[PDB]
């Protein structure tokens, strides 16, 4: 019994993402924190933050149980606030859950960079990629370069033998690289070939995976990738991390955004967990739900794991004790 969201026409891709973001408590706690986060003594009062508060308003309502029976909320109050930022939706290619996620995450960062004297905390989807290069003839490395991400946007690999595609294969295809053939070394003082390491250095608490299922064909038409990618409820990232030590990172599923159909009958939808606050506001549930705009329905886990994922909202956990 989570509230639905009204969709008339053009606004399903937002609803599906909202239902996803609402499944990540750390994002709601960051917003509860962020919107209340101020610094004493500073003489300049802080700049206001309509987006952070409008987004918390909705996600807090989708996070708790319904209050009025089968209630359906209206998130058009959010659409107006985003237009106060640069976002002007101008093509059908932009009616997308991932695109919006990157519009939202950028517009939150505008608000962190808005009030500058008071310290605002960095959002829990933030992580870093690291690139590094090692030479084969001397076994030594360059100093690293860093990079940032809000989502690991995995391109889908093409088939070779015909084994099932796994999320591990779409990740290792992305977090990996080739060798360069002509540039000099330092330890070998003079022309050389070295290996391009790509790994992730900072891991966010809320991990957004993205499967590039929607792209443009050879001659510009919308191309959809239909093949299924196998994923699990718990996911371990210890093989993609830079620091070479025995500490462990483990993530647990919170929501799966899914794209059904295409063009005329294309649609976004969300699998997500039921609210935890069953008088026990800390106990993350194991009953899954299927939400399509104003429609809410129970769903088993085998229903989630069989669906064709578009966005996966993983959240970090310490141990697998469920």
């Amino acid at each position, epitope marked *: 019994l989570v509230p639905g969201l009204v969709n008339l026409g053009n606004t399903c891709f937002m609803n599906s993402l909202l239902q996803g973001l609402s499944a990540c408590p750390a994002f709601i706690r960051w917003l509860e924190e962020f919107t209340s986060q101020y610094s004493r003594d500073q003489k300049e009062p802080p700049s206001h933050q309509y987006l952070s508060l409008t987004l918390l308003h909705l996600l807090k309502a989708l996070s708790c149980q319904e209050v009025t029976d089968d209630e359906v909320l209206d998130a058009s109050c959010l659409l107006d606030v985003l237009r106060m930022y640069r976002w002007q939706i101008s093509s059908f290619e932009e009616q997308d859950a991932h695109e919006l996620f990157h519009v939202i995450t950028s517009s939150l960062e505008d608000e962190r960079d808005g009030s500058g004297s008071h310290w605002k905390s960095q959002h829990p989807f933030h992580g870093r990629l690291t690139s590094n290069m090692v030479c084969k003839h001397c076994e030594h490395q360059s100093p690293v370069r860093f990079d940032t991400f809000d989502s690991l946007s995995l391109s889908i690999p093409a*088939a*070779t*033998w*015909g*084994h*099932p595609l*796994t999320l*591990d*294969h779409c*990740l*290792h*295809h992305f977090i*990996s690289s080739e060798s360069v053939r002509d540039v000099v070394c330092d330890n070998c003082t003079k022309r050389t070939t070295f290996v391009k390491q790509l790994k992730l250095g900072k891991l966010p608490q809320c991990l957004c995976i993205h499967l590039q299922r929607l792209s443009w064909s050879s001659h510009g038409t919308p191309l959809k990738r239909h093949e299924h990618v*196998q994923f699990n409820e718990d996911l371990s990232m210890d*093989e993609y991390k830079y620091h070479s030590n025995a500490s462990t990172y483990l993530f647990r599923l919170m929501a799966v955004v899914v794209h059904h159909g295409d063009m005329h009958s294309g649609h976004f939808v969300t699998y997500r967990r039921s609210p935890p606050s069953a008088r026990n506001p800390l106990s993350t549930s194991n009953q899954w739900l299927w939400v399509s705009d104003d429609t809410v329905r129970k769903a088993s886990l085998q229903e989630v794991l069989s669906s064709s994922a578009y966005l996966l909202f993983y959240e970090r956990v310490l141990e697998v004790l469920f």
Partner: antibody
Amino acid sequence: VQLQQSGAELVRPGASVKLSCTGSGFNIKDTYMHWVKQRPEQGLEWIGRIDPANGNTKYDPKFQGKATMTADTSSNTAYLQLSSLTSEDTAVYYCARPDGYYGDYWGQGTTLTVSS
Amino acid sequence: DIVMTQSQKFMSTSVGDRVSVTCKASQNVGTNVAWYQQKPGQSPKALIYSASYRYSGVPDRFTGSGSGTDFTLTISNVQSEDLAEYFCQQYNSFPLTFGAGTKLELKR
């Protein structure tokens, strides 16, 4: 649900041969499908993948000038055609067809032999 | 091309034992290694498709592990059914390549 192959054969060096496969479940062009070469010392080697919905296959570049591939759908016969045999071109040839739930389907082997 | 070094042609085990045949690849192949089984006179059987994932009809005795370059197939509580040839196979790149094949035997 088997994937039967053609019986074995024997030829002199310098000749050419062609093999066959067919199974008791369709999706023939609705899947990828492979041929591999097994001889005891060197071992298993992959030679190519067929795209039976069409026919512009991918070969191993150490085979392309010596192995060629075709197939048919309404009659489920996928073929292999290889040429200019030496006695070194003797091996058991398997044709394989992937599946996602079960382990991928393999056929009863075809044991090409070549000598003077 | 890419090749996988298998550790031996031959490994010795007990019944009810734990055994670990391995593969080492020429370059980073991600998670894209598959493990196969072949008993004399038979066609091969697929055991594990990603580095760790089991097919249907495969006992919990079999587990796969590894990433990038060093990979392992482990059989625990080895049964008398598990005396066969074991290959590993890449599907990261074209051409697809195997190992040499490892036979298993009861020590005595």
